[PDB]
Amino acid sequence: SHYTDNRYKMMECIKDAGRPFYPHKFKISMSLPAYALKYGNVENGYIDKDTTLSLSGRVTSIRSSSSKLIFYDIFCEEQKVQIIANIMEHDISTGEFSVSHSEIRRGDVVGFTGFPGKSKRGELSLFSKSVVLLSPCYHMLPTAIDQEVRYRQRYLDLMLNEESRKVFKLRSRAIKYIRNYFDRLGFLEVETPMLNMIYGGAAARPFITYHNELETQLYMRIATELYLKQLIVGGLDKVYEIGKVFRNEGIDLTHNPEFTSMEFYMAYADYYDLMDLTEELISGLVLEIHGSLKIPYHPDGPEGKCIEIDFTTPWKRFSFVEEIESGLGEKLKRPLDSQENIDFMVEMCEKHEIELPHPRTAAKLLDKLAGHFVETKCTNPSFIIDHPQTMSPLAKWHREKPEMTERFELFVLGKELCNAYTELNEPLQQRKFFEQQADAKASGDVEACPIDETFCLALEHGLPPTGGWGLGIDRLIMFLADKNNIKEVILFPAMR
Amino acid sequence: SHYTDNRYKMMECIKDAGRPFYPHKFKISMSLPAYALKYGNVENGYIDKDTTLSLSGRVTSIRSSSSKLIFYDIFCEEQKVQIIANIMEHDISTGEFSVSHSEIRRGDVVGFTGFPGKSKRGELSLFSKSVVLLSPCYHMLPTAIDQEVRYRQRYLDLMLNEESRKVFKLRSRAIKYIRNYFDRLGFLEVETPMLNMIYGGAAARPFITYHNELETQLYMRIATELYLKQLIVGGLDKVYEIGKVFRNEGIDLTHNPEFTSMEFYMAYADYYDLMDLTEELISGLVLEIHGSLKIPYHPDGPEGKCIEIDFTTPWKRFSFVEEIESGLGEKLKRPLDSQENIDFMVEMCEKHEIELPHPRTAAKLLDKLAGHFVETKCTNPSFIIDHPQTMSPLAKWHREKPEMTERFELFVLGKELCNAYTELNEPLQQRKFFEQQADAKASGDVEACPIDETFCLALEHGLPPTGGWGLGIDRLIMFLADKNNIKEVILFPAMRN
Numbered sequence: 001s002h003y004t005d006n007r008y009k010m011m012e013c014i015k016d017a018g019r020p021f022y023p024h025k026f027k028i029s030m031s032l033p034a035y036a037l038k039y040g041n042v043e044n045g046y047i048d049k050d051t052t053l054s055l056s057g058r059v060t061s062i063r064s065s066s067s068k069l070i071f072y073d074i075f076c077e078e079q080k081v082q083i084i085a086n087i088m089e090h091d092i093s094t095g096e097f098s099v100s101h102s103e104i105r106r107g108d109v110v111g112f113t114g115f116p117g118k119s120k121r122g123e124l125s126l127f128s129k130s131v132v133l134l135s136p137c138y139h140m141l142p143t144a145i146d147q148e149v150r151y152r153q154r155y156l157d158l159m160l161n162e163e164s165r166k167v168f169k170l171r172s173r174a175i176k177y178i179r180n181y182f183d184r185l186g187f188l189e190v191e192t193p194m195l196n197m198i199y200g201g202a203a204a205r206p207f208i209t210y211h212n213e214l215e216t217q218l219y220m221r222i223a224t225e226l227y228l229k230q231l232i233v234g235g236l237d238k239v240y241e242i243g244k245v246f247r248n249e250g251i252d253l254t255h256n257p258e259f260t261s262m263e264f265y266m267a268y269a270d271y272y273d274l275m276d277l278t279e280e281l282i283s284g285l286v287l288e289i290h291g292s293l294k295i296p297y298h299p300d301g302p303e304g305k306c307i308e309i310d311f312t313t314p315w316k317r318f319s320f321v322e323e324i325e326s327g328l329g330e331k332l333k334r335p336l337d338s339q340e341n342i343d344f345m346v347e348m349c350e351k352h353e354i355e356l357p358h359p360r361t362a363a364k365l366l367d368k369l370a371g372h373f374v375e376t377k378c379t380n381p382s383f384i385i386d387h388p389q390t391m392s393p394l395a396k397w398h399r400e401k402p403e404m405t406e407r408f409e410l411f412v413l414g415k416e417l418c419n420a421y422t423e424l425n426e427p428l429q430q431r432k433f434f435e436q437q438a439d440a441k442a443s444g445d446v447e448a449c450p451i452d453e454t455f456c457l458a459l460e461h462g463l464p465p466t467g468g469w470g471l472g473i474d475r476l477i478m479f480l481a482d483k484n485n486i487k488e489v490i491l492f493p494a495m496r
Numbered sequence: 497s498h499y500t501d502n503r504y505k506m507m508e509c510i511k512d513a514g515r516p517f518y519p520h521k522f523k524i525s526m527s528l529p530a531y532a533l534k535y536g537n538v539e540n541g542y543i544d545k546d547t548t549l550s551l552s553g554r555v556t557s558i559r560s561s562s563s564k565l566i567f568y569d570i571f572c573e574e575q576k577v578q579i580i581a582n583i584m585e586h587d588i589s590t591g592e593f594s595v596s597h598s599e600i601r602r603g604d605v606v607g608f609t610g611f612p613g614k615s616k617r618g619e620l621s622l623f624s625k626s627v628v629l630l631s632p633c634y635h636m637l638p639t640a641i642d643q644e645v646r647y648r649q650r651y652l653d654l655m656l657n658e659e660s661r662k663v664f665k666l667r668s669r670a671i672k673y674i675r676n677y678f679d680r681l682g683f684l685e686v687e688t689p690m691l692n693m694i695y696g697g698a699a700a701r702p703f704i705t706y707h708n709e710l711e712t713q714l715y716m717r718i719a720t721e722l723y724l725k726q727l728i729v730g731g732l733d734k735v736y737e738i739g740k741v742f743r744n745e746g747i748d749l750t751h752n753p754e755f756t757s758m759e760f761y762m763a764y765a766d767y768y769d770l771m772d773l774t775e776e777l778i779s780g781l782v783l784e785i786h787g788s789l790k791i792p793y794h795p796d797g798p799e800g801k802c803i804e805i806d807f808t809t810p811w812k813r814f815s816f817v818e819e820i821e822s823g824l825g826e827k828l829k830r831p832l833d834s835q836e837n838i839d840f841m842v843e844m845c846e847k848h849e850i851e852l853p854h855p856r857t858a859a860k861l862l863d864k865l866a867g868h869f870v871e872t873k874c875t876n877p878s879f880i881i882d883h884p885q886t887m888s889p890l891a892k893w894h895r896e897k898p899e900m901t902e903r904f905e906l907f908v909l910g911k912e913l914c915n916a917y918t919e920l921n922e923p924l925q926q927r928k929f930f931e932q933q934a935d936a937k938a939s940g941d942v943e944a945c946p947i948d949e950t951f952c953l954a955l956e957h958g959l960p961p962t963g964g965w966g967l968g969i970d971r972l973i974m975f976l977a978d979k980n981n982i983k984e985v986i987l988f989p990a991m992r993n
């Protein structure tokens with residue numbers, strides 16, 4: 001690009017001529033929002049020539065109306081201010097008017113000094129005496145924005161697209177709301193390690209790395225569960241953690257291998273308590289943001305249809321196995337993890353043209369059948385409940401239903417948002433389920449985790465009856481901000 | 497251990513007999529702190545037989561005073577309550593008194609139901625009618641806390657040691673205080689990626705991993721700086737991020753390869769602004785926690801001496817080069833990155849018995865000389881300022897001092913707490929500094945980073961004049977909580993197996 005090489009040449013020329021070259025410090029009189037709050041409502045043509053102010057922002061527009069008069073727009077902290085540069089007001093000690101303004105381009109970060117007020121046409125303005133080039137833009141900027149450029153050059157998206165800045169402000173506001181809710185209930189916010197000898201607490205492949213000091217391979221965490229439960233053994237009673245987890249899987253509209261999860265553990269809660277809390281927390285946050293529990297969603301982007309998501313509580317419950325059996329029009333075989341039921345579920349996947357998992361474990365077949373028959377019914381927030389033990393190695397046995405657990409998932413628009421259960425606190429069964437998971441792993445289940453003897457020893461010290469819970473923060477922001485691509489709610493998503 | 501196998505046998509016997517086996521839900525009437533607040537001021541011997549309450553906690557003490565009378569202490573949410581179990585009050589529908597209490601051991605998580613009040617001796621008590629075993633402890637618990645066990649089995653440390661629970665509560669309190677300070681200034685809290693094609697923004701070896709979907713090697717971040725600065729190009733004006741960084745270095749009292757850093761970027765700040773902010777933020781937090789700016793520290797653990805750290809402002813400033821030259825009694829050679837000055841610094845290291853770095857770059861030699869002559873003077877919070885450009889590839893040239901930058905580090909008790917500068921926003925020099933870093937890396941500098949063309953392209957879109965800043969959260973908690981081992985302020989530090 002000629003424009004880039006020429007801009008480097010003009011900056012070298014400015015430097016050699018002893019003209020202002022990347023000043024270290026520009027002292028603003030006030031922010032552009034403060035400027036608009038103070039002067040935004042003066043009458044048309046108002047000027048205070050007794051007040052000189054310094055303002056700064058990025059140039060969004062330059063219009064030289066005449067040889068004597070240049071109009072700028074500058075933008076900073078979500079406020080536009082017009083700058084009116086009249087040759088008659090120009091401070092010639094900064095250079096000749098034409099020379100000073102010839103150094104400025106659209107996209108440059110600049111300072112101005114001048115008098116406040118409003119143009120005769122009613123535009124909030126600074127009537128400038130000087131212009132200082134603080135940091136030039138070496139590229140011709142589009143006038144507006146190509147999802148690929150938006151994600152690979154996120155600074156361009158944020159510079160040019162108000163909608164993008166709104167999503168990240170909403171993300172921060174939602175995380176703050178969630179911390180406030182738990183902090184006021186007396187929860188302790190904690191950090192657990194991201195690099196560990198073992199990994200577990202979800203069904204995903206890990207990232208693997210090497211630690212020079214410990215001279216060992218380590219795994220990045222796929223979840224926080226196994227460490228957070230140790231803090232409940234430790235008596236901290238109520239803990240939460242919001243942070244990154246690393247699942248070495250696919251990239252698509254709803255998956256980013258690196259993503260933000262929240263988990264909390266509450267001593268003395270069961271999964272019934274956690275369903276009520278999920279409804280209160282999420283409906284409260286939706287109300288705070290939207291002013292009602294019925295909110296818009298564009299499942300095919302903003303050029304597509306608009307649907308309504310209804311967060312009115314209480315939410316629909318679907319029983320995992322019963323809803324599959326309704327879909328199939330016949331019963332799964334018992335026990336659910338019998339070879340008989342594995343063969344039957346393979347037959348049902350073939351009959352209903354459901355892609356088979358590998359390996360063909362009872363757990364992975366149940367998951368495929370749920371995906372086809374149950375998750376697809378979950379448009380409004382819906383709980384899928386009472387998952388089989390065989391697919392829920394850390395969930396406590398159901399107090400009424402053989403082979404099931406006290407588990408739920410929250411689904412919105414067919415996507416998982418939450419996963420929660422009455423925690424398994426019985427170490428004999430826990431060890432058995434970990435051995436079964438390790439067997440599935442050794443048979444080629446790349447999503448099954450190795451045994452964690454440190455965790456089993458922690459359970460042997462007595463985990464109180466406990467309820468635990470996870471939330472996908474990125475997926476939450478997708479619904480709250482109405483984005484159908486997870487890359488919209490992550491500042492720098494990893495790209496090909 | 498016989499004790500563990502026998503406890504598994506007792507639980508199997510309970511299960512087979514149809515007796516309570518890991519109840520799913522115990523409904524407490526109120527927390528133990530709420531119980532103490534409600535009944536803590538009744539007169540000695542008060543009992544309300546008209547009120548039945550359910551309480552739960554971990555058994556810290558069992559004393560069978562007689563065949564008819566058992567005293568328990570339970571603990572939950574930082575409150576102890578005594579349970580008085582008299583055979584005459586026992587609910588026989590839960591089993592015979594002897595059978596019900598025979599199932600309970602020190603360390604068990606249990607529920608009790610009973611009448612509230614106070615023993616004749618004045619002890620806050622529940623006069624129990626029933627006991628339920630909720631989650632047994634299969635191990636004989638030590639009566640008190642070994643560092644190794646405390647770190648490998650943190651649940652035992654937290655269960656038995658109030659001082660350990662206090663450290664983690666103080667850590668959460670300090671992080672909340674810091675978020676509040678920046679949130680009230682209009683900062684946006686952000687998340688930037690931990691797994692990237694490139695790494696940069698500090699001087700450390702990286703962790704390496706492999707991404708299945710992208711079919712590529714990636715690095716874990718060593719810092720957040722290069723992404724956060726792009727958000728200031730993006731016009732977000734004030735951003736911060738508190739999160740993990742991964743530096744594939746040593747483990748010692750003040751280093752954990754995985755640790756928590758905070759970075760912030762403020763448009764239109766310079767390093768003078770950031771020194772004043774550092775003083776206000778840190779002195780404010782110390783005052784909030786301690787009620788003064790002079791706080792105790794045990795540099796050799798609690799059996800050793802106690803010193804005082806004084807956070808009173810203004811903090812001492814040491815100029816990097818001038819303080820080295822005071823130490824040497826003579827001047828470094830100019831330019832600082834000349835072979836002449838490299839040879840001279842090697843001669844000075846040999847003269848003063850300072851261990852040489854490898855490779856012998858101007859930057860690494862300057863660092864060794866600072867470590868010997870300047871960092872050692874930093875007991876109270878002290879700013880080391882105006883670092884040479886050659887060791888500061890992302891710091892803007894000093895507006896007054898040739899070859900220096902607008903940089904500071906904050907040191908406390910000779911340890912780095914903060915690193916900050918007027919940000920370099922001139923892309924020609926930036927590219928040159930990155931090329932010099934890549935050269936140092938190819939010459940054997942394992943702490944020098946590869947060039948980041950994505951970052952250079954971002955600078956070509958115009959980074960406003962900016963001030964940026966990093967803080968080691970763990971090291972801050974070490975000073976605030978008076979711990980001399982970083983493993984004291986990290987819940988689960990990774991240990992040798």
Ligand SMILES: N=[N+]=NCCOCCOCCOCCNC(=O)c1ccc(S(=O)(=O)Nc2cc(F)cc3c(=O)cc(C(=O)NCC4CCCCC4)oc23)cc1
Pocket residue numbers: 202203204247248249250251254255256257258259261262416417418419447470471472473474475486708709710711
């Ligand atoms: N092409 N090519 N070339 C290379 C050859 O291919 C090799 C690589 O294959 C990739 C294809 O993989 C297919 C098989 N794998 C899966 O189908 C799979 C999907 C999801 C999962 S997951 O663990 O249940 N979930 C998640 C996994 C993930 F990577 C990202 C997210 C995420 O961004 C958000 C959430 C979330 O917010 N979920 C909600 C929960 C709630 C409870 C707390 C945690 C979050 O969940 C996620 C596991 C496996």
Ligand SMILES: N=[N+]=NCCOCCOCCOCCNC(=O)c1ccc(S(=O)(=O)Nc2cc(F)cc3c(=O)cc(C(=O)NCC4CCCCC4)oc23)cc1
Pocket residue numbers: 212213214215698699700743744745746747750751752753754755757758912913914915965966967968969970971982
């Ligand atoms: N035995 N054996 N086995 C195998 C053989 O051993 C091979 C391995 O060699 C180990 C020996 O390593 C010696 C060489 N390397 C260093 O000496 C070194 C030291 C520090 C650094 S560092 O990047 O400047 N700093 C930090 C690096 C680190 F790993 C942890 C921390 C930390 O826990 C906290 C802080 C902090 O709070 N610092 C403050 C800053 C402020 C600004 C923001 C960020 C934090 O800083 C840290 C880099 C290198």
Ligand SMILES: N[C@@H](CCCC[NH3+])C(=O)O
Pocket residue numbers: 201202222223224225261263419420421423468469470471
């Ligand atoms: N670790 C779970 C979330 C918590 C489930 C209940 N303990 C997950 O990542 O899905």
Ligand SMILES: N[C@@H](CCCC[NH3+])C(=O)O
Pocket residue numbers: 697698718719720721759890915916917919964965966967
């Ligand atoms: N990235 C730096 C902290 C910020 C320095 C100023 N931009 C470090 O880790 O030391």
